Amino acid sequence: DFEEKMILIRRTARMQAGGRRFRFGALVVVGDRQGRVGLGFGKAPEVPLAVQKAGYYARRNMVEVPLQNGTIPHEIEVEFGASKIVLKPAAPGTGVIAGAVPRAILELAGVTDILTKELGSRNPINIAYATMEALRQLRTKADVERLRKG
RNA sequence: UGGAGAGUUUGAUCCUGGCUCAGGGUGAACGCUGGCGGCGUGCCUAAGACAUGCAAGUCGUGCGGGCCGCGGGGUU
Ligand SMILES: [Mg+2]
Ligand SMILES: [Mg+2]
Ligand SMILES: [Mg+2]
Ligand SMILES: [Mg+2]
Ligand SMILES: [Mg+2]
Ligand SMILES: [Mg+2]
Ligand SMILES: [Mg+2]
Ligand SMILES: [Mg+2]
Ligand SMILES: [Mg+2]
Ligand SMILES: [Mg+2]
Ligand SMILES: [Mg+2]
Ligand SMILES: [Mg+2]
Ligand SMILES: [Mg+2]
């Protein structure tokens, strides 16, 4: 059903009289490679607990990606903080031309041919968030049609 | 029919921002190594200095000769 991908895991530290106190951050992608993708970022005392928490959170955050012959209905450029993502539609045979973060998402989203580009802050966390916002914003001829029918 | 990023400022974080790496190219050079062939290519520096040979001539159907030679004439 849903395939999970781990974007990254960081160790993060905090301070107390005595020393440092770690936590673990986990960014996890989940999708059915059939138009549904979810992002999840969970943290916990230990990695596993974190990951699991991430996965659990991903499923809580789903996006309905309007796949088309394997690509996206058009181009969007989304800015999440200092990270900017650029998604450009492509023909078949192209493949998923993207950095690891946007890829993992696009792939589990069902996207198969797409032109991508990371601009601004390359921060994986905000890039991944930038992506979901991009996809989430994709519209369709029918969608526009609906909106401008009035 | 066309576009991937990564490492590094912090105890940790986000940002800014420089440095650095992965790719492609070259009339190359250097090191270790070196079997065959085809096609290309080879002073990028002193437009510095050059031994030696060759690199622009040809025409007797424009012309008159010199030199070396043969043949035939005008005479007893
Ligand atoms: Mg770090
Ligand atoms: Mg900005
Ligand atoms: Mg990435
Ligand atoms: Mg930058
Ligand atoms: Mg500082
Ligand atoms: Mg440090
Ligand atoms: Mg501080
Ligand atoms: Mg940088
Ligand atoms: Mg040769
Ligand atoms: Mg030659
Ligand atoms: Mg020269
Ligand atoms: Mg010379
Ligand atoms: Mg000269």
PDB file of C-alpha atoms (C1' of nucleotides) and ligand atoms in Angstrom:
ATOM      1  CA  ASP A   1       0.000   0.000   0.000  1.00  0.00           C
ATOM      2  CA  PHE A   2       2.135   2.876   1.334  1.00  0.00           C
ATOM      3  CA  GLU A   3       5.890   2.912   0.815  1.00  0.00           C
ATOM      4  CA  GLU A   4       8.001   4.833   3.332  1.00  0.00           C
ATOM      5  CA  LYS A   5      11.236   6.659   2.610  1.00  0.00           C
ATOM      6  CA  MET A   6      13.558   8.254   5.158  1.00  0.00           C
ATOM      7  CA  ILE A   7      14.749  11.632   3.845  1.00  0.00           C
ATOM      8  CA  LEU A   8      17.143  12.130   6.763  1.00  0.00           C
ATOM      9  CA  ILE A   9      17.909  11.766  10.450  1.00  0.00           C
ATOM     10  CA  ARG A  10      19.799  14.354  12.510  1.00  0.00           C
ATOM     11  CA  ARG A  11      21.131  14.084  16.057  1.00  0.00           C
ATOM     12  CA  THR A  12      20.291  17.506  17.604  1.00  0.00           C
ATOM     13  CA  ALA A  13      21.656  18.501  21.054  1.00  0.00           C
ATOM     14  CA  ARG A  14      20.450  20.541  24.053  1.00  0.00           C
ATOM     15  CA  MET A  15      22.232  21.735  27.217  1.00  0.00           C
ATOM     16  CA  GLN A  16      21.832  21.181  30.953  1.00  0.00           C
ATOM     17  CA  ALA A  17      24.090  21.727  33.938  1.00  0.00           C
ATOM     18  CA  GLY A  18      25.971  18.514  33.378  1.00  0.00           C
ATOM     19  CA  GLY A  19      26.243  18.233  29.620  1.00  0.00           C
ATOM     20  CA  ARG A  20      24.431  17.808  26.320  1.00  0.00           C
ATOM     21  CA  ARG A  21      21.078  16.083  25.873  1.00  0.00           C
ATOM     22  CA  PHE A  22      20.314  14.624  22.471  1.00  0.00           C
ATOM     23  CA  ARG A  23      17.125  14.051  20.514  1.00  0.00           C
ATOM     24  CA  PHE A  24      16.627  12.620  17.079  1.00  0.00           C
ATOM     25  CA  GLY A  25      14.872  14.219  14.181  1.00  0.00           C
ATOM     26  CA  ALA A  26      13.420  12.147  11.352  1.00  0.00           C
ATOM     27  CA  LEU A  27      11.991  13.250   7.993  1.00  0.00           C
ATOM     28  CA  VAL A  28       9.927  10.511   6.381  1.00  0.00           C
ATOM     29  CA  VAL A  29       8.073  10.357   3.072  1.00  0.00           C
ATOM     30  CA  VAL A  30       5.148   8.081   2.417  1.00  0.00           C
ATOM     31  CA  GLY A  31       3.268   7.377  -0.774  1.00  0.00           C
ATOM     32  CA  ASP A  32       1.427   4.842  -2.915  1.00  0.00           C
ATOM     33  CA  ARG A  33       3.368   5.716  -6.073  1.00  0.00           C
ATOM     34  CA  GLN A  34      -0.120   6.302  -7.406  1.00  0.00           C
ATOM     35  CA  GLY A  35      -0.811   9.961  -6.683  1.00  0.00           C
ATOM     36  CA  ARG A  36      -0.629  10.046  -2.882  1.00  0.00           C
ATOM     37  CA  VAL A  37       2.352  11.402  -0.918  1.00  0.00           C
ATOM     38  CA  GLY A  38       2.771  12.414   2.693  1.00  0.00           C
ATOM     39  CA  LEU A  39       5.605  14.084   4.617  1.00  0.00           C
ATOM     40  CA  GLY A  40       6.446  13.496   8.224  1.00  0.00           C
ATOM     41  CA  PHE A  41       8.995  14.948  10.615  1.00  0.00           C
ATOM     42  CA  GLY A  42       9.091  13.417  14.049  1.00  0.00           C
ATOM     43  CA  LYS A  43      11.614  13.511  16.834  1.00  0.00           C
ATOM     44  CA  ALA A  44      12.216  11.338  19.865  1.00  0.00           C
ATOM     45  CA  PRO A  45      14.789  10.159  22.453  1.00  0.00           C
ATOM     46  CA  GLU A  46      15.834   7.376  20.082  1.00  0.00           C
ATOM     47  CA  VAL A  47      15.987   7.122  16.264  1.00  0.00           C
ATOM     48  CA  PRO A  48      13.498   4.267  15.792  1.00  0.00           C
ATOM     49  CA  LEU A  49      10.906   5.884  18.007  1.00  0.00           C
ATOM     50  CA  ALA A  50      11.495   9.048  15.974  1.00  0.00           C
ATOM     51  CA  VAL A  51      11.235   7.448  12.565  1.00  0.00           C
ATOM     52  CA  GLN A  52       8.076   5.591  13.527  1.00  0.00           C
ATOM     53  CA  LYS A  53       6.706   8.854  14.856  1.00  0.00           C
ATOM     54  CA  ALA A  54       7.604  10.481  11.517  1.00  0.00           C
ATOM     55  CA  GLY A  55       5.878   7.765   9.503  1.00  0.00           C
ATOM     56  CA  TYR A  56       2.844   8.100  11.721  1.00  0.00           C
ATOM     57  CA  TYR A  57       2.880  11.864  11.048  1.00  0.00           C
ATOM     58  CA  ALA A  58       3.363  11.473   7.297  1.00  0.00           C
ATOM     59  CA  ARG A  59       0.083   9.565   6.942  1.00  0.00           C
ATOM     60  CA  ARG A  60      -1.469  12.466   8.820  1.00  0.00           C
ATOM     61  CA  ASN A  61      -0.269  14.843   6.104  1.00  0.00           C
ATOM     62  CA  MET A  62      -1.377  13.631   2.657  1.00  0.00           C
ATOM     63  CA  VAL A  63      -1.302  15.329  -0.726  1.00  0.00           C
ATOM     64  CA  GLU A  64      -3.261  14.373  -3.841  1.00  0.00           C
ATOM     65  CA  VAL A  65      -0.747  14.745  -6.712  1.00  0.00           C
ATOM     66  CA  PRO A  66      -2.507  15.087 -10.108  1.00  0.00           C
ATOM     67  CA  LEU A  67      -0.263  12.729 -12.048  1.00  0.00           C
ATOM     68  CA  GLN A  68      -0.456  12.904 -15.871  1.00  0.00           C
ATOM     69  CA  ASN A  69       1.236  10.375 -18.097  1.00  0.00           C
ATOM     70  CA  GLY A  70       3.807  10.331 -15.310  1.00  0.00           C
ATOM     71  CA  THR A  71       4.422  14.036 -14.915  1.00  0.00           C
ATOM     72  CA  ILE A  72       2.818  17.140 -13.417  1.00  0.00           C
ATOM     73  CA  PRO A  73       0.059  19.304 -15.010  1.00  0.00           C
ATOM     74  CA  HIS A  74       2.332  22.343 -15.175  1.00  0.00           C
ATOM     75  CA  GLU A  75       5.166  24.219 -13.509  1.00  0.00           C
ATOM     76  CA  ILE A  76       5.115  25.706 -10.026  1.00  0.00           C
ATOM     77  CA  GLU A  77       7.840  27.399  -8.050  1.00  0.00           C
ATOM     78  CA  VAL A  78       7.248  27.452  -4.306  1.00  0.00           C
ATOM     79  CA  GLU A  79       9.229  29.290  -1.629  1.00  0.00           C
ATOM     80  CA  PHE A  80       9.219  27.840   1.872  1.00  0.00           C
ATOM     81  CA  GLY A  81      11.195  30.204   4.020  1.00  0.00           C
ATOM     82  CA  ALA A  82      14.555  30.568   2.344  1.00  0.00           C
ATOM     83  CA  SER A  83      14.232  27.424   0.283  1.00  0.00           C
ATOM     84  CA  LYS A  84      12.670  27.656  -3.138  1.00  0.00           C
ATOM     85  CA  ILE A  85      11.696  24.670  -5.220  1.00  0.00           C
ATOM     86  CA  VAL A  86      11.075  24.548  -8.937  1.00  0.00           C
ATOM     87  CA  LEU A  87       8.960  21.840 -10.506  1.00  0.00           C
ATOM     88  CA  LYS A  88       8.805  21.678 -14.307  1.00  0.00           C
ATOM     89  CA  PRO A  89       6.738  19.146 -16.298  1.00  0.00           C
ATOM     90  CA  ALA A  90       8.608  16.716 -18.525  1.00  0.00           C
ATOM     91  CA  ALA A  91       8.031  14.120 -21.238  1.00  0.00           C
ATOM     92  CA  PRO A  92       8.442  10.344 -20.725  1.00  0.00           C
ATOM     93  CA  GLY A  93      11.868   8.786 -20.727  1.00  0.00           C
ATOM     94  CA  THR A  94      13.096  11.912 -18.973  1.00  0.00           C
ATOM     95  CA  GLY A  95      12.977  10.479 -15.493  1.00  0.00           C
ATOM     96  CA  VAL A  96      12.966  12.236 -12.157  1.00  0.00           C
ATOM     97  CA  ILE A  97      15.685  14.839 -12.429  1.00  0.00           C
ATOM     98  CA  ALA A  98      15.936  16.143  -8.903  1.00  0.00           C
ATOM     99  CA  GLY A  99      17.932  16.346  -5.740  1.00  0.00           C
ATOM    100  CA  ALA A 100      17.543  13.510  -3.253  1.00  0.00           C
ATOM    101  CA  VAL A 101      14.924  15.252  -1.142  1.00  0.00           C
ATOM    102  CA  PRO A 102      12.498  16.371  -3.871  1.00  0.00           C
ATOM    103  CA  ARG A 103      13.076  13.033  -5.569  1.00  0.00           C
ATOM    104  CA  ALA A 104      12.069  10.724  -2.722  1.00  0.00           C
ATOM    105  CA  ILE A 105       8.831  12.682  -2.536  1.00  0.00           C
ATOM    106  CA  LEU A 106       8.154  12.946  -6.258  1.00  0.00           C
ATOM    107  CA  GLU A 107       8.909   9.243  -6.658  1.00  0.00           C
ATOM    108  CA  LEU A 108       6.610   7.999  -3.902  1.00  0.00           C
ATOM    109  CA  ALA A 109       4.081  10.474  -5.270  1.00  0.00           C
ATOM    110  CA  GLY A 110       3.767   8.564  -8.494  1.00  0.00           C
ATOM    111  CA  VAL A 111       5.687  11.199 -10.471  1.00  0.00           C
ATOM    112  CA  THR A 112       7.913   9.570 -13.053  1.00  0.00           C
ATOM    113  CA  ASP A 113       9.173  12.273 -15.444  1.00  0.00           C
ATOM    114  CA  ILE A 114       9.887  15.732 -14.030  1.00  0.00           C
ATOM    115  CA  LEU A 115      12.395  18.606 -14.176  1.00  0.00           C
ATOM    116  CA  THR A 116      13.379  19.940 -10.752  1.00  0.00           C
ATOM    117  CA  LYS A 117      15.613  22.618  -9.268  1.00  0.00           C
ATOM    118  CA  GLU A 118      16.579  23.602  -5.721  1.00  0.00           C
ATOM    119  CA  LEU A 119      17.189  27.318  -5.279  1.00  0.00           C
ATOM    120  CA  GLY A 120      17.771  29.423  -2.182  1.00  0.00           C
ATOM    121  CA  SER A 121      18.510  27.623   1.047  1.00  0.00           C
ATOM    122  CA  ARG A 122      19.161  23.977   0.248  1.00  0.00           C
ATOM    123  CA  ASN A 123      17.981  23.066   3.747  1.00  0.00           C
ATOM    124  CA  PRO A 124      16.496  19.547   3.307  1.00  0.00           C
ATOM    125  CA  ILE A 125      13.823  20.152   5.835  1.00  0.00           C
ATOM    126  CA  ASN A 126      12.493  23.331   4.240  1.00  0.00           C
ATOM    127  CA  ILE A 127      13.087  22.037   0.748  1.00  0.00           C
ATOM    128  CA  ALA A 128      10.910  19.016   1.473  1.00  0.00           C
ATOM    129  CA  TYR A 129       8.288  21.319   2.937  1.00  0.00           C
ATOM    130  CA  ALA A 130       8.656  23.545  -0.086  1.00  0.00           C
ATOM    131  CA  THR A 131       7.996  20.533  -2.304  1.00  0.00           C
ATOM    132  CA  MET A 132       4.787  19.369  -0.638  1.00  0.00           C
ATOM    133  CA  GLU A 133       3.536  22.930  -0.927  1.00  0.00           C
ATOM    134  CA  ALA A 134       4.358  22.901  -4.639  1.00  0.00           C
ATOM    135  CA  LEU A 135       2.560  19.647  -5.340  1.00  0.00           C
ATOM    136  CA  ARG A 136      -0.319  20.615  -3.051  1.00  0.00           C
ATOM    137  CA  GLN A 137      -0.721  23.702  -5.248  1.00  0.00           C
ATOM    138  CA  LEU A 138      -0.833  21.913  -8.598  1.00  0.00           C
ATOM    139  CA  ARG A 139      -4.105  22.479 -10.425  1.00  0.00           C
ATOM    140  CA  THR A 140      -5.726  20.847 -13.410  1.00  0.00           C
ATOM    141  CA  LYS A 141      -7.549  21.878 -16.563  1.00  0.00           C
ATOM    142  CA  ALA A 142     -10.689  20.531 -14.902  1.00  0.00           C
ATOM    143  CA  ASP A 143      -9.781  22.359 -11.685  1.00  0.00           C
ATOM    144  CA  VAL A 144      -9.266  25.676 -13.424  1.00  0.00           C
ATOM    145  CA  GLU A 145     -12.372  24.938 -15.441  1.00  0.00           C
ATOM    146  CA  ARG A 146     -14.317  24.449 -12.215  1.00  0.00           C
ATOM    147  CA  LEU A 147     -12.944  27.716 -10.784  1.00  0.00           C
ATOM    148  CA  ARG A 148     -13.610  29.875 -13.810  1.00  0.00           C
ATOM    149  CA  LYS A 149     -16.958  28.370 -14.829  1.00  0.00           C
ATOM    150  CA  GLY A 150     -19.057  30.614 -12.591  1.00  0.00           C
TER     151      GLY A 150
ATOM    152  C1'   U B   1      12.931  16.850 -25.291  1.00  0.00           C
ATOM    153  C1'   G B   2      15.256  20.468 -21.055  1.00  0.00           C
ATOM    154  C1'   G B   3      17.506  22.271 -15.137  1.00  0.00           C
ATOM    155  C1'   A B   4      19.980  16.564  -9.088  1.00  0.00           C
ATOM    156  C1'   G B   5      23.464  18.455  -5.549  1.00  0.00           C
ATOM    157  C1'   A B   6      27.076  17.629  -1.422  1.00  0.00           C
ATOM    158  C1'   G B   7      31.087  18.959   2.725  1.00  0.00           C
ATOM    159  C1'   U B   8      32.481  23.088   6.019  1.00  0.00           C
ATOM    160  C1'   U B   9      30.907  28.781  10.995  1.00  0.00           C
ATOM    161  C1'   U B  10      26.996  26.159  16.206  1.00  0.00           C
ATOM    162  C1'   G B  11      26.469  22.634  22.338  1.00  0.00           C
ATOM    163  C1'   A B  12      22.388  22.620  19.045  1.00  0.00           C
ATOM    164  C1'   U B  13      18.982  25.771  15.301  1.00  0.00           C
ATOM    165  C1'   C B  14      17.462  28.929  11.147  1.00  0.00           C
ATOM    166  C1'   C B  15      19.682  32.415   7.885  1.00  0.00           C
ATOM    167  C1'   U B  16      23.524  34.986   5.549  1.00  0.00           C
ATOM    168  C1'   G B  17      27.974  34.010   3.202  1.00  0.00           C
ATOM    169  C1'   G B  18      32.849  32.480   1.345  1.00  0.00           C
ATOM    170  C1'   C B  19      35.859  28.116   0.487  1.00  0.00           C
ATOM    171  C1'   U B  20      35.699  23.061  -1.462  1.00  0.00           C
ATOM    172  C1'   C B  21      34.078  18.451  -4.168  1.00  0.00           C
ATOM    173  C1'   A B  22      31.253  15.424  -7.820  1.00  0.00           C
ATOM    174  C1'   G B  23      30.680  16.769 -14.397  1.00  0.00           C
ATOM    175  C1'   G B  24      32.557  18.211 -19.154  1.00  0.00           C
ATOM    176  C1'   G B  25      36.703  20.039 -22.045  1.00  0.00           C
ATOM    177  C1'   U B  26      42.414  20.699 -23.676  1.00  0.00           C
ATOM    178  C1'   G B  27      47.664  21.695 -29.637  1.00  0.00           C
ATOM    179  C1'   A B  28      49.051  19.887 -23.024  1.00  0.00           C
ATOM    180  C1'   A B  29      52.881  18.599 -19.738  1.00  0.00           C
ATOM    181  C1'   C B  30      54.735  15.371 -15.604  1.00  0.00           C
ATOM    182  C1'   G B  31      54.772  10.190 -12.781  1.00  0.00           C
ATOM    183  C1'   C B  32      54.050   4.786 -12.638  1.00  0.00           C
ATOM    184  C1'   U B  33      52.714   1.629 -16.961  1.00  0.00           C
ATOM    185  C1'   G B  34      52.656   0.362 -21.974  1.00  0.00           C
ATOM    186  C1'   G B  35      50.585  -4.887 -27.127  1.00  0.00           C
ATOM    187  C1'   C B  36      48.320  -4.007 -32.444  1.00  0.00           C
ATOM    188  C1'   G B  37      45.721  -0.912 -36.103  1.00  0.00           C
ATOM    189  C1'   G B  38      42.738   3.190 -38.530  1.00  0.00           C
ATOM    190  C1'   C B  39      41.904   8.340 -38.704  1.00  0.00           C
ATOM    191  C1'   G B  40      43.460  12.773 -36.848  1.00  0.00           C
ATOM    192  C1'   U B  41      47.033  15.712 -34.488  1.00  0.00           C
ATOM    193  C1'   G B  42      52.220  17.640 -32.763  1.00  0.00           C
ATOM    194  C1'   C B  43      57.234  24.812 -30.727  1.00  0.00           C
ATOM    195  C1'   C B  44      51.229  27.114 -26.879  1.00  0.00           C
ATOM    196  C1'   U B  45      58.116  29.772 -25.145  1.00  0.00           C
ATOM    197  C1'   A B  46      62.712  33.584 -28.321  1.00  0.00           C
ATOM    198  C1'   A B  47      58.431  37.519 -34.771  1.00  0.00           C
ATOM    199  C1'   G B  48      65.450  34.494 -30.989  1.00  0.00           C
ATOM    200  C1'   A B  49      69.818  33.046 -33.973  1.00  0.00           C
ATOM    201  C1'   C B  50      70.552  29.794 -38.048  1.00  0.00           C
ATOM    202  C1'   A B  51      75.221  25.335 -41.056  1.00  0.00           C
ATOM    203  C1'   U B  52      73.472  22.398 -45.252  1.00  0.00           C
ATOM    204  C1'   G B  53      70.058  20.610 -49.415  1.00  0.00           C
ATOM    205  C1'   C B  54      65.482  21.448 -51.762  1.00  0.00           C
ATOM    206  C1'   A B  55      61.271  25.223 -51.857  1.00  0.00           C
ATOM    207  C1'   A B  56      59.858  29.096 -59.426  1.00  0.00           C
ATOM    208  C1'   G B  57      60.131  28.620 -63.449  1.00  0.00           C
ATOM    209  C1'   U B  58      59.137  27.716 -68.440  1.00  0.00           C
ATOM    210  C1'   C B  59      59.129  28.876 -73.957  1.00  0.00           C
ATOM    211  C1'   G B  60      63.761  27.255 -80.377  1.00  0.00           C
ATOM    212  C1'   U B  61      56.457  27.270 -82.709  1.00  0.00           C
ATOM    213  C1'   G B  62      59.380  35.455 -80.866  1.00  0.00           C
ATOM    214  C1'   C B  63      65.276  36.352 -81.913  1.00  0.00           C
ATOM    215  C1'   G B  64      70.572  36.429 -82.953  1.00  0.00           C
ATOM    216  C1'   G B  65      74.686  34.222 -81.306  1.00  0.00           C
ATOM    217  C1'   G B  66      79.231  31.576 -78.516  1.00  0.00           C
ATOM    218  C1'   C B  67      81.529  26.896 -77.603  1.00  0.00           C
ATOM    219  C1'   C B  68      82.155  21.283 -78.808  1.00  0.00           C
ATOM    220  C1'   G B  69      80.795  17.735 -83.102  1.00  0.00           C
ATOM    221  C1'   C B  70      79.136  15.329 -87.732  1.00  0.00           C
ATOM    222  C1'   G B  71      77.369  15.711 -93.007  1.00  0.00           C
ATOM    223  C1'   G B  72      76.935  17.999 -97.945  1.00  0.00           C
ATOM    224  C1'   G B  73      78.364  22.049-101.305  1.00  0.00           C
ATOM    225  C1'   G B  74      81.510  26.393-104.741  1.00  0.00           C
ATOM    226  C1'   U B  75      88.123  24.327-106.880  1.00  0.00           C
ATOM    227  C1'   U B  76      92.330  20.786-110.417  1.00  0.00           C
TER     228        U B  76
HETATM  229 MG    MG C   1      24.976  20.191  11.316  1.00  0.00          MG
HETATM  230 MG    MG C   2      13.666  34.899   0.262  1.00  0.00          MG
HETATM  231 MG    MG C   3      17.934  17.120  -1.831  1.00  0.00          MG
HETATM  232 MG    MG C   4      23.288  30.059  -0.320  1.00  0.00          MG
HETATM  233 MG    MG C   5      30.164  32.289  14.857  1.00  0.00          MG
HETATM  234 MG    MG C   6      31.568  21.865  15.640  1.00  0.00          MG
HETATM  235 MG    MG C   7      24.846  30.047  21.352  1.00  0.00          MG
HETATM  236 MG    MG C   8      27.463  26.791   1.575  1.00  0.00          MG
HETATM  237 MG    MG C   9      49.538   8.357 -37.981  1.00  0.00          MG
HETATM  238 MG    MG C  10      52.274  13.676 -39.793  1.00  0.00          MG
HETATM  239 MG    MG C  11      55.054  30.625 -32.573  1.00  0.00          MG
HETATM  240 MG    MG C  12      62.481  28.889 -32.754  1.00  0.00          MG
HETATM  241 MG    MG C  13      63.635  35.576 -37.098  1.00  0.00          MG
END
